[PDB]
Amino acid sequence: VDKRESYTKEDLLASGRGELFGAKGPQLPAPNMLMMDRVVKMTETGGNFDKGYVEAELDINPDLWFFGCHFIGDPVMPGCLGLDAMWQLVGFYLGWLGGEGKGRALGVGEVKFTGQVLPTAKKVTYRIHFKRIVNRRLIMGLADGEVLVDGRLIYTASDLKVGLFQDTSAF
Amino acid sequence: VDKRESYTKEDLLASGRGELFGAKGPQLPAPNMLMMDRVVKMTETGGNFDKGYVEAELDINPDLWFFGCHFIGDPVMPGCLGLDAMWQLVGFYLGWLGGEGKGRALGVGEVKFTGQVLPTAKKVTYRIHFKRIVNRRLIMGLADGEVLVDGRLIYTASDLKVGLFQDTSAF
């Protein structure tokens, strides 16, 4: 895969279609499960553990689908979706490294939500710090993640774990 | 509130509008974020810790929205949504006990996905085992959860934490 340092909305839409990393690489979900608008920085070193880093962003506007149903009369972005954006990124990175197989979130250690994303926010930032990568014949990625809303750290997640599966029926 | 041990799809939809437990109580998300069709059993005792139990179900069909976008050509229910259903149920139980305020998931201890829900499955079962409730000036619920697909355990979550906030400015 020709690694780029950044990807645009159109690159992420292609990803979901299987065009970015090709037919044997992982895919990101398509709207409305896609939780990022852009990947601004990807590096194989750096990050808190110096073993990789990814930063992505989601632009907030009052019309985003999830605000209307969550909750009626009390709009707030579901923390589960911000968490999913982090699993989505770990899987995207494994494919960026050239890993083959479809992505599947395997788990996460501690997750703490200390604030919320309201429809008046402007931007959500996702920062992923890779701890361990097993790109052997068993691709797995381990990482810590952070979610910031307009620069304020609101969610942390330790040990996000994602694996790539050549044959998904074995899951 | 008048406690019942089971609720229908209709009750759950009324809950999305605050019409089940009243305006002062918490709400469940409305479609498409509502992740269960019915609550089959709720008890104040029972469960693995004899401190509360909740069993709910989600009927599966190939047409559920999330199969189409997650992923294209590889339909699988997002584990993040199964996880959210567990947070939704803890908040619902807190309201059922007569709690007042809006629900906000505060976190989870450890999550493990060891299986997946495909469009060929028929039913997802959620089991929540309460371990501690704080229904004072501070209302929080701590529980362990399990997700089963067609009777087989696929996800587990320890220490799901949810709080009811009277003033969401405290977040």
Swiss-Prot record, chains A, B:
> Matching InterPro entries, A to Z?
FabA, FabA_FabZ, HotDog_dom_sf
Q: In which pathway does it act?
A: Lipid metabolism; fatty acid biosynthesis
Activity regulation: the record says: Irreversibly inactivated by 3-decynoyl-N-acetylcysteamine (DNAC) which binds to the active site and forms an adduct.
Record flagged with keyword Lipid biosynthesis: yes
Q: What induces it?
A: Mainly activated by FadR, but minor repression is also conferred by FabR.
User: Keywords on this record?
Assistant: Cytoplasm, Fatty acid biosynthesis, Fatty acid metabolism, Isomerase, Lipid biosynthesis, Lipid metabolism, Lyase
Q: What is the protein's major site of localization?
A: cytoplasm
Give the residues annotated as active site: H70
Give the GO cellular component terms, alphabetically. Answer: cytosol
- Where does the record say this protein resides? Cytoplasm
Reactions catalysed according to its record? a (3R)-hydroxyacyl-[ACP] = a (2E)-enoyl-[ACP] + H2O; (3R)-hydroxydecanoyl-[ACP] = (2E)-decenoyl-[ACP] + H2O; (2E)-decenoyl-[ACP] = (3Z)-decenoyl-[ACP]; (3R)-hydroxybutanoyl-[ACP] = (2E)-butenoyl-[ACP] + H2O
What's a single GO BP term from this record?
fatty acid biosynthetic process
Give an example GO molecular function. Answer: (3R)-hydroxyacyl-[acyl-carrier-protein] dehydratase activity
Q: In which domain of life is the source organism classified?
A: Bacteria
This chain belongs to which protein, by name? 3-hydroxydecanoyl-[acyl-carrier-protein] dehydratase
State the organism named in the record.
Escherichia coli (strain K12)
